[PDB]
Amino acid sequence: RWCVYAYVRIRGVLVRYRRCW
Numbered sequence: 242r243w244c245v246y247a248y249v250r251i252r253g254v255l256v257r258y259r260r261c262w
Contacts, residue, residue: 246258246259
């Protein structure tokens with residue numbers, strides 16, 4: 242019951258996104 246963001250390597254770049262349990 243929590244959510245957190247993370248960064249992924251896409252297009253040789255670092256993109257941030259939001260995640261949830």
